[PDB]
Nucleic acid binder design. Structure first.
Ligand SMILES: Nc1ncnc2c1ncn2[C@@H]1O[C@H](COP(=O)(O)OP(=O)(O)NP(=O)(O)O)[C@@H](O)[C@H]1O
Ligand SMILES: Nc1ncnc2c1ncn2[C@@H]1O[C@H](COP(=O)(O)OP(=O)(O)NP(=O)(O)O)[C@@H](O)[C@H]1O
Ligand SMILES: [Mg+2]
Ligand SMILES: [Mg+2]
Lengths: 636, 417
DNA sequence: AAAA
DNA sequence: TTTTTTTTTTTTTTTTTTTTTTTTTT
């Protein structure tokens, strides 16, 4: 019974008319037909006959198949609060398949709307009777929502061929005050008024009675005065303010950029939902606002920039396993959802790869997705109570952050460490704003010249850490016979970073590596194997762990008090002339290699034996042919 | 037109003066209208009523058509001359005023005038006062009586805040429920400790005055902490539960200053947690005592007048090392509880040690974002709260756990040099 | 001259 | 140690209009 809905709903007929416009050639196959069915099913749940009407065409597939699968799809879309496709796609398809013949329908439609108003109110046009017409014309290029501060904001969908910034096609852009809408009202809407005027003139020409001619003359005279108010500034402001309500789409800001599988690139929007990555450079409906200005091309090793970057990167670090691991870790920066609670921390003598690769990745990802942070977020204590901290309000939605400065050797803290690497949550304040808690997801790295000071032994601080050090050195005096020395090129920094082409090549490298990791190790960065790492890191762990050094250097029962005093004096003698109030030493004493010497004195004291307190000196992999990026074999 | 509008819809809008002194608009949502996710059958705050504007311009217009046709009708019938002249003048004057309802300034004036009629005194401070009502994704949940009843129709309870977690009756046969129960039993083996720690976490849904008590348990690392704690917060939503900052405990007393936003959390909340430390810290034995006593406390927000509020929220804090406490008074050390984890998750679970299990790097990176597991966990919590209420009459202290009040009193036997 |  | 200053209110909210508008039309 589509006829009743046609009677009741004009939009239903209009939408059906749109279906009438585009060919059924794409309706024939299941994918596109299911797409349009889902789209119209998103618009209310009573349009079922319309698609059902659309179903009898080519009834051979409809019956025995299409007929029952249509209601199946309708039921499925009924309970799928999921990605939404709406009528905008149908209008775009109609504009594509049948251009210049569908429009006359739309001008007829909103001409009818305007004529209905002008007849109903004798040519006295006010606000909100132009807002409806404007919303009818451009309802697929503007969306209004309310942000936290309570202000209304305007977003518009850009299209090719209009003035715009660099590389923001097919994406929404925030606008403080809609210019394009004002020019549209002033210029494009004026054409419809001409249609109304000529229609009035036409019906005035035809012979009729006296009273009807008088009525038409009065209507024309009244409408003429109202015809020129669309150019008034205050009237346009009123129209915009009224139209703000019609355009509103609730739950738009809070769903903006929420999908972590979509990236905004310079030539469209990039999707890494499936393998391989698919580049969208046409109409779509995903709510993507932020972007990076780097165009994307498929990864091709034949590009000269690609070869140069690969060769230079291989020159940066020789070891194959370390190279693959550090590239896999960096490739996860493009992802923005929950990641592994891991952190990289590598330092070098100087003129190496530090403060270089991080920068390159930083520029490639753009300020929207990556940014540099401040080391005071680590080597400083927490701010007192609720003093606002705008520095911490970086990395809010950022996918990558890096550090490059240190002052000699200093502490690292652990509270901040266990705060900025966990896949949990975090809360903070910036300035003149209320307290806010935001999910944090970003790969982090730190570059320095000296080691960091760590004072702990638990997993909660050592699980999340990795360590590396450079094995090359760039200088103008490349002494031969030393492979750990290369002639520096003072051109990778002062230029070769500002060049867009190398940035595109590097982005291709990164996306290729992310695809490789996803399809090989199922996204588990810990699952990959690297002998140099998790050995050098645990060697660093074999330092910074003075308890074992004290045990191997200075170690009757002597009870327990001697141990903390011996540790403190050993600290003064070998480490620092200061105490460490290590009353807790007992628990990690028995957690250390002391169980065999552990004793339990009758005077309710569990103590140690074998306390030979030494005071002064009394004693007792493979290499590839020419393609390392080729991922190597399965063990790799 | 304000009187007419108030006649039309006076049952879907309420106006009250907020703290700052500016009128605000609330409206009651109904199924089948444009709306956010999971806020049905509840009042939603509205900065500027747009629905009222569109209603004024569209639905109220039909009445004007009735007036116009009535005028035409009484003009049709034969009468005197003067009466017809009067009716003509009336019709023309009304027609001149018929289009004013579409003007923006006129609508703004109408709304401003209607602000006085719609006002319902004492509406803000009576909002969300009842602790027995919970706003859920598919309505509002009542825990006044056992069993808990779900309201998904018309009512008059002034409920504004909510959580976006749909509620279903507790069915152990659901795969998510069984998986959560199994993982939870794996988290802590002891039956008594598991029951006690679940009873403590069950009271978080309550928002009235609770028993003064604090939970504080540490782990070696890679333990269930920050999994179930964050799970509870995710289930409850930021409206009812949110993370805190350890500076409210480790730092000194908050100086007079003027504002305090970090402490302005846990006002109207029912649950908060800390999961960050370093080495060890002192708790001052104060600035927490009033955060656990069932009394009120005073502080202020940004550029806002001084205010006080009640302290009603279950607390918990995690770390890796022990905490530093220096006191022996019966007043303190009595409203504290301590647990120590006995398990550990790793990729290499060496056998012969029951205190060791294979890690599953999937409970965290997902299994929290999935709505259905959150629904199952909410069902678990409501079932446990019902059990506690019907067994121990709502007294968390009356329940018995040999593992607790033994390890905690052993801690009391420490820290007493 | 009063009304639009 | 320095605790307070930095942040804060703000801060624009009357102008916009409205009305008229004489002239025009009756
Ligand atoms: N693979 C390479 N081949 C040749 N020159 C290179 C290569 N990588 C980097 N360089 C050059 O070496 C320099 C790198 O400096 P840089 O990496 O910033 O030093 P660093 O590692 O940060 N130590 P420092 O800058 O003192 O903290 C620049 O002049 C680069 O052009
Ligand atoms: N049955 C289980 N229940 C819970 N977690 C499990 C289970 N089996 C394995 N796990 C692992 O436990 C992890 C959750 O604990 P997690 O929060 O990572 O430890 P943590 O204590 O918070 N780290 P830390 O804060 O430094 O001590 C998951 O990521 C899994 O890898
Ligand atoms: Mg460098
Ligand atoms: Mg944990």
């Amino acid at each position: 019974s589509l006829s009743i809905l046609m009677l009741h709903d004009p939009e239903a007929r209009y939408l059906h008319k749109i279906l009438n416009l585009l060919p059924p050639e794409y309706y024939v196959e299941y994918p596109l037909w299911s797409n349009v069915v889902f789209a119209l099913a998103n618009t209310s749940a009573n349009y079922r006959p319309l698609a059902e009407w659309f179903s009898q065409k080519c009834p051979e597939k409809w019956n025995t198949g299409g007929k029952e699968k249509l209601e199946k799809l309708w039921n499925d879309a009924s309970h799928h609060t999921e990605k939404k496709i709406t009528k905008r796609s149908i209008m775009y398809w109609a504009h594509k398949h049948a251009p210049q013949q569908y429009k006359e329908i739309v001008e007829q439609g909103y001409f009818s709307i305007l004529a209905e108003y002008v007849y109903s109110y004798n040519g006295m046009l006010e606000h909100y009777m132009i807002a409806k017409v404007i919303y009818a014309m451009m309802g697929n290029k503007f969306v209004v929502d309310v942000d936290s501060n309570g202000k209304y904001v305007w977003f518009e969908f850009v299209l090719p061929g209009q003035p715009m910034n660099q590389g923001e096609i097919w994406k929404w852009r925030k606008e403080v005050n809609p210019d394009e809408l004002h020019i549209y009202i002033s210029e494009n809407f004026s054409r419809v008024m001409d249609r109304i005027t000529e229609h009035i003139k036409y019906h005035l020409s035809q012979p009729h009675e006296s009273n009807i001619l008088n009525y038409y003359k009065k209507l024309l005279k009244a409408f003429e005065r109202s015809k020129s108010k669309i150019f008034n500034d205050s009237f346009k402001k009123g129209v915009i303010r009224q139209a703000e309500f019609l355009f509103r789409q609730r739950s738009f800001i809070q769903t903006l950029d929420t999908n972590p599988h979509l990236l905004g690139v310079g030539n469209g929007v990039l999707s890494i939902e499936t393998i391989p990555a698919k580049l969208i450079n046409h109409f779509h409906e995903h709510p993507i606002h932020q972007y990076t200005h780097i165009c994307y091309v498929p990864f091709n090793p034949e590009n000269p920039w690609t070869k140069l970057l690969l060769n230079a990167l291989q020159d940066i670090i020789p070891e194959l396993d370390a190279r693959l691991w550090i590239m896999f870790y960096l490739s996860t920066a493009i992802f923005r959802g929950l990641k592994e609670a891991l952190m990289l921390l590598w330092l070098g003598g100087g003129c190496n790869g530090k403060t270089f690769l991080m920068r390159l990745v930083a520029m490639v990802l753009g300020d929207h997705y990556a940014s540099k942070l401040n080391i005071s977020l680590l080597t400083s204590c927490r701010e007192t109570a609720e003093k606002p901290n705008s520095a911490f309000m970086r990395l809010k939605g950022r996918g990558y952050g890096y550090f490059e400065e240190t002052n000699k050797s200093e502490v690292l803290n652990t509270s901040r460490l266990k705060e900025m690497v966990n896949p949990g949550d975090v809360t903070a304040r910036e300035l003149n704003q209320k307290q806010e808690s935001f999910q944090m997801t970003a790969t982090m790295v730190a570059a320095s010249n000296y080691n960091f000071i760590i004072d702990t032994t638990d997993h909660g601080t050592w699980r999340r850490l990795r360590h590396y050090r450079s094995k090359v050195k760039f200088c103008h005096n490349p002494d031969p016979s030393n492979p750990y020395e290369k002639k520096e090129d003072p051109r990778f920094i002062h230029e070769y970073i500002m060049d867009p082409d190398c940035q595109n090549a590097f982005f291709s490298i990164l996306v290729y590596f992310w695809e490789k990791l996803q399809k090989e190790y199922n996204g588990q960065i810990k699952k990959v194997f690297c002998p140099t790492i998790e050995s050098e890191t645990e060697a660093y762990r074999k330092s910074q762990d003075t308890l074992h050094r004290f045990i191997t250097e200075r170690v009757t029962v002597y009870n327990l008090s001697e141990v903390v005093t011996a540790y403190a004096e050993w600290y003064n003698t070998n480490i620092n002339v200061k105490r460490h109030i290590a009353l807790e030493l007992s628990q990690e004493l028995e957690n250390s290699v002391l169980e065999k010497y552990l004793q339990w004195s009758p005077n309710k004291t569990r103590i140690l034996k074998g306390c030979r307190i030494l005071h002064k000196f009394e004693t007792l992999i493979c290499e590839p042919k020419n393609k390392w990026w080729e991922w190597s074999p399965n063990p790799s």
